[PDB]
Amino acid sequence: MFEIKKICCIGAGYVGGPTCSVIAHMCPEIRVTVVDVNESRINAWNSPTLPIYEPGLKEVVESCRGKNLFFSTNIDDAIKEADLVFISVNTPTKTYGMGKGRAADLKYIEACARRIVQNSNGYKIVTEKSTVPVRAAESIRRIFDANTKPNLNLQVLSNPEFLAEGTAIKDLKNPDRVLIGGDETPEGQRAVQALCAVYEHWVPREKILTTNTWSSELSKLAANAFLAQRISSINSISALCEATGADVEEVATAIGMDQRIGNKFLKASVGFGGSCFQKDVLNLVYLCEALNLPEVARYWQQVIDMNDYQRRRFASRIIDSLFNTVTDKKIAILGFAFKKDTGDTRESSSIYISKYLMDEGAHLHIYDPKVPREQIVVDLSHDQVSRLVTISKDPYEACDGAHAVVICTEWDMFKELDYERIHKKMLKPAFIFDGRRVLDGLHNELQTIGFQIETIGKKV
Amino acid sequence: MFEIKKICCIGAGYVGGPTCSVIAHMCPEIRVTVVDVNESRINAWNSPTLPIYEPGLKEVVESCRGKNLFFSTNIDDAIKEADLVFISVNTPTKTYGMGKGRAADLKYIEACARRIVQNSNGYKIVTEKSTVPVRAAESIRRIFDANTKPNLNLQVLSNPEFLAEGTAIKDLKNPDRVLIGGDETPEGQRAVQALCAVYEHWVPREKILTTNTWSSELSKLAANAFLAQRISSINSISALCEATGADVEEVATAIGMDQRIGNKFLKASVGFGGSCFQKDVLNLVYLCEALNLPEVARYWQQVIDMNDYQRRRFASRIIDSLFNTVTDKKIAILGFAFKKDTGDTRESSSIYISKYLMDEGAHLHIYDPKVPREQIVVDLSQVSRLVTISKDPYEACDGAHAVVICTEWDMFKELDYERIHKKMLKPAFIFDGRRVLDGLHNELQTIGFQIETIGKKV
Amino acid sequence: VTDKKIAILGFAFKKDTGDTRESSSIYISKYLMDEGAHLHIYDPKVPREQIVVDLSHDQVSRLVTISKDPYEACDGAHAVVICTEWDMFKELDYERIHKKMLKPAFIFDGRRVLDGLHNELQTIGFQIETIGKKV
Ligand SMILES: O=c1ccn([C@@H]2O[C@H](COP(=O)(O)OP(=O)(O)O[C@H]3O[C@H](CO)[C@@H](O)[C@H](O)[C@H]3O)[C@@H](O)[C@H]2O)c(=O)[nH]1
Ligand SMILES: O=c1ccn([C@@H]2O[C@H](COP(=O)(O)OP(=O)(O)O[C@H]3O[C@H](CO)[C@@H](O)[C@H](O)[C@H]3O)[C@@H](O)[C@H]2O)c(=O)[nH]1
């Protein structure tokens, strides 16, 4: 009855950090070491202020770091001394070659695999842990099969993480379900059981689903695409609301009361973001094209096309509402993160709205509570960032002297802003573009204040 | 407080009929009369055997027919007498004009509004209650605006119906929500409250949604589109599973367990049928095209296209497995209804699979416990040469090359497959389009069957 | 194939000549170059300078190397791509080539020259793929 005592995780990211921190917290007698090549990131995980923002993570991490949980960058000894090894690195979409701008680049998963083999002896369980697993588990096993040592016995499992950034701790503390994939051998089922026992410390038996490696990845690929589809479906409906004169918040409620559909993920928005959804759908389309399933690839493609359209339509409305020029006009961008309560910008619609407006000559003022200043400048370029982009220290700075305020991220605090103060210093007429619906019910207040408030899924 | 006391309902179909029979049942003190042009149909609504099969429906109707609920062809008098007039007539898709085979025809709706006006005096609330409402309430209000009598005071309302056929009685007795669309006038809100108060007899107040006319019709369209998309998405995954050795049922479980997705409506199938989904999606597309939203049109069009693909892929697998020749080969089709526990065959998947096989010259033998023989011969119209309606499943499999399962009748598991296989031609194939035979796989294989099912391949 | 060493054995359009004009080796090389591979080309007769010319419009500087013998082209390589039927390629020491390759070690026989060598190469440990025949 193999029991896991030492866990090494390769990847100190939004997935790896939080996951292992909870595993450490819930399991005191099992030592968990998180390793990364990025010294900066590891130093931060060891300091008072962490490298990522996640509600509740500070308490989790500080309650068992140095008792039971470690951060090292010494990848070699952690691997050597471990029973289970997570691979939680990133898989960027390729920038050249076939599958450019679509297919996932497995160059880090492979390099990891290769290093494990170099530093491993005896038995070890290697589990692939990611948001979007694209032929991950197979790649690893392919490396291990071909690079065997004497008395080395490596098992490959799949274990896709379902956490959502912003609510990671809650999700990791109480997940809808846990998904472990491993070979339908007896070698095999034993490694699955041994990981199953890890989770059985805080997740009950019948919430842990055990299937085969591939099924597990296909399950994650599909699940991510279904959720992405809901957001796009309601976003499509939001477009229809605007041309006909209904409310998408109202239409969404009517929909959501059907228990077969359910009421979650029906908030219309400027466009879904994050390192998952788009990457997931593009890789699902690519997979399908490779298996000669054009019809299926054509079907899921629409989830991307619709998201693009949502972003582009919202943008045109801004320029449209400002007499078809924003040249030399000051515009405030409130919220830069892809979603609330996180520092992460990857694939954020704020990045897209900002760029589209800069191309029309707007002087932007960006504010976000938790996105670092340096990140914003990177995202927004590839010098024009010098001329047009300023980074504000508070919302009211971004708004002073501004022709319009664009809300891109549903930060709670945005509802709580002093709007009498903001209107007073804006140039008139002052516009608010709510790309998140966060200012519903506030309509009347804001109009009477003198605003021309334009929001998605509702047209004047 | 305007109190409704007499209800008339033009259209006694799979919607008009049950809905009214339940309204009547829930409210003893209010008279419900259901009218229809079709004489044959109205006589069946009064007879021991109803014109539609729907579980629970018989005990419900025969608890208040001739007492609170009446069924009559005398339309002109039910209207004259009623405070509330439901419009539950079918809207076939236009066979000609701009938007042939896409848009819905509003000629029956328009001839109702004309009939209403003639036989109407005083205040009356007119309510459009259908499953795919397309600009419906706006066509009615428009006829009312044009033809104005002295002291006529008609109020138009939208009350779409969320019942699923085969579980209609449950869905009506205990709905998820009721949706009432009225004009944002005070005239208006008085009209909405009266109807709201009819439902308050059995429906809790926080399950009744009040909105304007259009916001109600758009929500219905969306609502049916969202469900159809669910089936098509899991169907697409089924194709991908067959190409890669996974199981769509196992995948649907893992997907379903996410509380933000929901576990309902993720059963992969030969494809969705019903008088709703296909009509509903195509209409949404047509609207979007009309409003200059080609982006939105193309998106929802993928729900229909995936469904066409799933059906066609299923048809090809059958043909393929029989060496690409099915001339004079007996095939059993089990299940002609679009779903289980109904006799409705509108847009049924079994129609399309059947016709594909028929194009290959196959001799078809069809069985359904509830679908009228005549309905099958109409739906497939060659008929004389290839199609036979079987009176029991075993006479459909006697000497057949393949058994094809299209409807999820509970009677289809539990068949004596020992007996079926003995009299079948080998190789004996079973094509399970509904996953009804799950679990039984090993039994069927040792019996000697080659069992093929959607979302899983050898 | 970013940063992956791959040996290109043969660059001539066919055996017993140094002519490279419209050789498949130029295309296979360019396709693998677009993947960011580090190519090490060997040919017994094709001049070194002619190769770099055929592989040009800087991408060459970063990605191409010309090998003086086959064994340096394969030393630490991920795959051996045979593109020209030089008789010498059948005669190579594939025991030696393997011990210094990165695994999985691949041989892509574009010319069918390693026929009848398949069992020796498999037991040695190569995953040998050829045209006109698949696993
Ligand atoms: O109703 C909604 C919900 C979300 N979004 C947007 O979509 C994006 C994604 O949000 P979310 O899904 O919560 O963040 P993720 O961290 O990407 O998490 C999702 O994707 C993860 C992998 O990234 C899965 O593991 C999780 O289960 C799933 O919740 C955000 O930009 C949101 O604004 C909407 O527009 N409307
Ligand atoms: O997981 C599933 C569920 C259903 N179906 C099929 O989809 C079609 C339609 O199913 P169903 O929705 O149950 O029948 P409907 O009578 O069309 O009912 C739906 O459509 C109505 C409008 O027609 C709405 O009012 C209802 O709320 C909605 O449940 C049928 O052929 C089913 O077999 C599947 O293939 N897979």
Number of helices of chain A: 19
Radius of gyration of chain A: 24 Å
CATH C-level category of the largest domain in chain A: Alpha Beta
The CATH topology annotation of the largest domain in chain A reads as: Rossmann fold
- Beta-strand proportion of chain A: 5-15%
- Name the CATH homologous superfamily of the largest domain in chain A: NAD(P)-binding Rossmann-like Domain
The CATH architecture term of the largest domain in chain A is: 3-Layer(aba) Sandwich
Question: How does the major sheet of chain A shape up?
Answer: 6 strands, parallel
Order of strands in the sheet with most strands of chain A: 3-2-1-4-5-6
CA-CA gap between termini of chain A = 67 Å
Quaternary structure classification: part of a larger assembly
Chain pair forming the biggest interface: A-B, 59 and 60 residues
Look at the helices and sheets of chain A and give the structural class: alpha/beta
Shape of chain A: globular
| Ligands present | uridine-5'-diphosphate-glucose
Domain count of chain A: the total is: 3
Helix content of chain A: 40-55%
What is the β-strand count of chain A?
14
PDB class: oxidoreductase
Keywords: open hexamer, ugdh, UPG, NAD, oxidoreductase
Entry title: Crystal Structure of Human UDP-Glucose Dehydrogenase
Chains A, B, C: UDP-glucose 6-dehydrogenase
